[model samples]
Structure formats: structure tokens, C-alpha cells
Target: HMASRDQVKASHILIKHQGSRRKASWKDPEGKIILTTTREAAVEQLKSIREDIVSGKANFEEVATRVSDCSSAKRGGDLGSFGRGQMQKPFEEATYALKVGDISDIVDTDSGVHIIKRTA
Candidate 1:
């Protein structure tokens, strides 16, 4: 008998912070740590992201392009398509557990707190 598996698609939210130094680590692509000036600024960014999504000001692709730092963000946060045995353990757990179009609750991974949304 041959084995069988399924493909997975999911979305995520990423929070980037420096190790050992929270405030001093917040920077843009230019390496300017502007958020160190105020914790509210960092928190507000997250709040705004969630709000924009709820209000539809930011669709998944647009938001990921603007905010996600992962290399996969180039495809609007898509990790492309993959089947079983194709991803890391933790990532696969999160991805395969989700139903198409289902958004995960905030989850902390090495990258950040992700609200993963699976798609067919």
C-alpha cells in the first residue's frame, strides 16, 4: 500500500524583537530602533494590525507584505504549498491541525505570535 497525505496552507503574524534587549531591538529594515522611545508604540503596532484585519483595512496578503519579515512574505505570507513530511514538526502541527480558512488563535513560535489561517 502507498502512503497518503494532504497539502497545507496557512497565514501567520510575526513579532520581531531583539534577544536580551526588548526595546533596544525594535527596528525597521534600516536598523533604527524607534520603538525604544515608547513601549506604547510597539504595542500599538500590534493592536493596529489586529484592528486593520478585523476591519478589512488589511487583507492577509497586503498586511503580510507590509509587516511580515519572514522570507516567505514575498508571496504575501504564503509558505507556498507542501504536504506531510515537508515541514518542521511544530510548524506542521499548526498547519495540519487547521481547516481551510480557519484562523488560529495567537501562538508564540520562535518567530512571533502567529494567528495562523489555513486555506485550501
Candidate 2:
């Protein structure tokens, strides 16, 4: 007999800015202001947030609350446990590529930008 779980527990900081959507903006590490009408702009914001987390300047949960637009934001961006195919293609691909405790680079999807952290 055997038991197995093909699941990953993850959290993410989502910044949605696609098409005509506006109101998303940020300042990079060097204090350069950026707006999110373009993909590169969103990426910059994600990178800045990721760097802050890695540099110990901010924790995942707090940053999520301050930055994420997903409903999971209240739970600190927690998506709980999910398996392959349960998430957006790009998101799932990025999440699976990470090891436990690793944070992903910015992942772009139809909905928005995602910075994922694999917790399990």
C-alpha cells in the first residue's frame, strides 16, 4: 500500500495590470517611478518586491497585503494546496519549477503578473 500527494502549497503577490487597466504603479530600488500599462513595468514592480523579500526588508505576508490584488491577499496570498492543472498554465509552470522555500521570477498570465513562493 502507498499514499501519495501530487500537490504544492504556494502563496503569491499578484499585481494585475492588463490592457486599459490603470492605477497600478511602483518605484523601483533606485526610486525610479514606474507605471503598469506595459508588461515590463509590472515586471519591475514584481522584481522590486521579490528583492525586498529576499533582502529581508519585507516578509511575504505583509507585502502581499500591501501589493496583491487577489482575494487570497487577506490570507497573505496563500493559495493553499493545489496540483498541476489547478492553476493558470503559466502560474503552474512557474510554481512547479520552484523548490520549497524558493520564490519565482515574475510570471505573466492572462489575468496579471504573479510572483510565487513555493512553501511546500
Candidate 3:
């Protein structure tokens, strides 16, 4: 594709921690878990989820749908295509740095810990 910020296409699994800006998530309507979860707990959760996908024990789509805290889980974690300025700074930077078909390491944002799969 011709370049023009090309707009990376990424899907992600978010694990909201106690410090997350929003307390509730698609799975946790009461936000009780978010209030109790620590950042370390959130990051560690995403780590294993990513490992399972990479190990072929599970696919990213199914994992995201079942485990992700984001509402985007309904779309298999799809945030669709987005250009710079459309996402959190750390998430945006990580996606831009990854090659297509690559996954970023744990990324921290006020929203939570994320493991992103770059599709384009």
C-alpha cells in the first residue's frame, strides 16, 4: 500500500487495573475487578494470554473476545484502522513501530495494560 500515515490496523486485549481511568469494562459491568486489580496483575494477565496465542493454544481473536476488558472485544478487539493522534500515546507508538503481523510487548496506558496485534 502507498504510504500516508498508512494507518495501522490493530486489535488488542486490554486488562484494566485499579488505576484505570474507567472502572467498568464490557465484562465487568460493576467495575469491581478493576478497583481491585493491580497493574502488575493486569500486565501479567496479558502476558500469558499473549503466550497462549503465540503458542497456538488459542488464537488472538478468541482470546480477545473472551478475556479482554475492552468493549471492542465484541469485534474481536478490533479498533479498526487508525492514524496517529487517534490512540493513546504509548499504544500508538508501539503499533507504529511494529511490522504487520507482529505483536507488541506489554503496553501501558491510563486505560490499562495492552498487547496489540498489528494487522496493517
TM-score of each: 0.55, 0.69, 0.71
How well is each residue in 2-115 modelled by candidate 1, as lDDT tens digits? 377567756665544442344222243665445342334444555555555555534676666555545535544666667675555666687777654434433444454445
Candidate lDDT (C-alpha), each: 0.52, 0.65, 0.66
Give the runs in model 2 whose Cα sits over 4 Å from its true position.
19-37
Weakest lDDT window of 10 consecutive positions for candidate 3: 26-35
Ranking by TM-score: 3, 2, 1
Model 2 alpha-carbon miss at residue 98, Å:
0.5
CA lDDT of 70 in candidate 2? 42
Roughly what TM-score does model 1 have, to 2 decimal places?
Answer: 0.55
Error of 3 at 112 (Å): 0.8
lDDT of 1 at 111: 51
Candidate 2 shows a clash count of 0
How would you encode candidate 2's per-residue C-alpha lDDT over 1-111 as one tens digit per residue?
329866777777777554244433433254543554467776787677666665664566786776665454566567777876467678887777876444777766645
Best by lDDT: 3
Q: Which segments of candidate 1 are over 4 A away from where they belong?
A: 1-3, 18-58, 83-87
